[PDB]
RNA sequence: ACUCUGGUUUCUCUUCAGAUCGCAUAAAUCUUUCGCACUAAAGAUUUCCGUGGAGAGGAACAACUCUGAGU
């Protein structure tokens, strides 16, 4: 935004609140069905294709149970 | 609210918290679309419209919608068709107006200075014979033909 | 469009000239205004207008 | 056209901002005489295609129904039509006299 | 043949609406398809242009033509 910073006061905050309320009111036209479809679509997308971090989170959490003494015991690949 | 004198918006737009002004500027394509869709018809010289204008003059929408009765609209445009053909047959040297009206950087004209007191030359209204066009000659060329008549339309 | 209308209102041109100028403006948007480059799909609309001219 | 037809039989059984369309996009390039020269509508000699000049349509119409009326109309009907045409042509001539260069 | 509701106009809010919600017609995004995608099709979503139905509220002037009911 070209007006990210500037003379912002209580009247500017009121104007921004009014215009945001107007935008919300405009979005109310199809808000329920649009948000329902968005939630269903994102849920099915996450269920079908899981992010790699999600796939490795199980092993990441199972990896917590390790002593600090074993960390120093990690060898190299010289053998 | 109620409609205000047209001189108020005139003075406001003559004289000109930036957040209000910037937020009002966002809806400009609606202003363009409502101005263009309320465009006067060739048979109208002046078309007064209800206007919702920002208090700071940053924007002004033409509030109304172009509601026209389909048979009346089609008949008016058929009469326009006849008149246009007659005029083009009459005028062999028809001159199209300059494609880019006004200078590239000519300051915009002030309506209260050179448009307010100038009356239109004429409209493209077709002449209607009273013997056959008796039921329609009273309102065939109005901004909204029977808007104020309770019998023919539902209301305002 | 507004400049053509104010030109008619001043009285310089006739109402027939005003209507013909509006027809030319709405049939020659691409020539009078550089719109097609910024939005390619708009070009389609332009052809429509020209087609409509060929129709009228 | 016949070569176009026989060809048809065989075939079936065997950037730039362009403002104006290209002529190759045209259709209705037929070989059948029944489809090239299509018999226009004569709406009983009383209906006319929209937009076109009424006088041009009257002049270029097939004049079949005019012959039909001049053959079928009785003498009184002929007099009635002649009087109506006289009055209409008088009005048209008055309009033409008013609209002169 | 006598009584009694339901009035019309306009403004605003809420909700439903697959109804040609619209006898009109745009834009964006994604996927797919063969080209090599303004000059291209398919599928889907969404946003705008603005309607209909129902309800509620406001104010404007009409109160029994009609719809009927009670006779």
From Swiss-Prot, chain A:
<feature type="modified residue" description="Phosphoserine">
    <location>
        <position position="57"/>
    </location>
</feature>
<comment type="function">
    <text>Involved in pre-mRNA splicing as component of the U4/U6-U5 tri-snRNP complex, one of the building blocks of the spliceosome. Enhances dihydrotestosterone-induced transactivation activity of AR, as well as dexamethasone-induced transactivation activity of NR3C1, but does not affect estrogen-induced transactivation.</text>
</comment>
<comment type="subunit">
    <text>Identified in the spliceosome B complex. Identified in the spliceosome C complex. Associates with the U5 snRNP particle. Component of the U4/U6-U5 tri-snRNP complex composed of the U4, U6 and U5 snRNAs and at least PRPF3, PRPF4, PRPF6, PRPF8, PRPF31, SNRNP200, TXNL4A, SNRNP40, DDX23, CD2BP2, PPIH, SNU13, EFTUD2, SART1 and USP39, LSm proteins LSm2-8 and Sm proteins. Interacts with ARAF. Interacts with AR and NR3C1, but not ESR1, independently of the presence of hormones. Interacts with USH1G.</text>
</comment>
<protein>
    <recommendedName>
        <fullName>Pre-mRNA-processing factor 6</fullName>
    </recommendedName>
</protein>
Curated annotation (Swiss-Prot), chain B:
<protein>
    <recommendedName>
        <fullName>Pre-mRNA-processing-splicing factor 8</fullName>
    </recommendedName>
</protein>
<comment type="function">
    <text>Plays a role in pre-mRNA splicing as core component of precatalytic, catalytic and postcatalytic spliceosomal complexes, both of the predominant U2-type spliceosome and the minor U12-type spliceosome. Functions as a scaffold that mediates the ordered assembly of spliceosomal proteins and snRNAs. Required for the assembly of the U4/U6-U5 tri-snRNP complex, a building block of the spliceosome. Functions as a scaffold that positions spliceosomal U2, U5 and U6 snRNAs at splice sites on pre-mRNA substrates, so that splicing can occur. Interacts with both the 5' and the 3' splice site.</text>
</comment>
<comment type="subunit">
    <text>Part of the U5 snRNP complex. Component of the U4/U6-U5 tri-snRNP complex composed of the U4, U6 and U5 snRNAs and at least PRPF3, PRPF4, PRPF6, PRPF8, PRPF31, SNRNP200, TXNL4A, SNRNP40, DDX23, CD2BP2, PPIH, SNU13, EFTUD2, SART1 and USP39. Component of the U5.U4atac/U6atac snRNP complexes in U12-dependent spliceosomes. Within the minor spliceosome, which acts on U12-type introns, interacts with PPIL2 and RBM48. Core component of U2-type precatalytic, catalytic and postcatalytic spliceosomal complexes. Found in a mRNA splicing-dependent exon junction complex (EJC) with SRRM1.</text>
</comment>
Curated annotation (Swiss-Prot), chain D:
<comment type="subunit">
    <text>The phosphorylated form (by SRPK2) is a component of the U4/U6-U5 tri-snRNP complex composed of the U4, U6 and U5 snRNAs and at least PRPF3, PRPF4, PRPF6, PRPF8, PRPF31, SNRNP200, TXNL4A, WDR57, SNRNP40, DDX23, CD2BP2, PPIH, SNU13, EFTUD2, SART1 and USP39. Identified in the spliceosome C complex. Interacts with ERBB4. Interacts with ERCC6.</text>
</comment>
<comment type="function">
    <text>Involved in pre-mRNA splicing and its phosphorylated form (by SRPK2) is required for spliceosomal B complex formation. Independently of its spliceosome formation function, required for the suppression of incorrect R-loops formed during transcription; R-loops are composed of a DNA:RNA hybrid and the associated non-template single-stranded DNA.</text>
</comment>
<comment type="similarity">
    <text>Belongs to the DEAD box helicase family. DDX23/PRP28 subfamily.</text>
</comment>
<protein>
    <recommendedName>
        <fullName>Probable ATP-dependent RNA helicase DDX23</fullName>
    </recommendedName>
</protein>
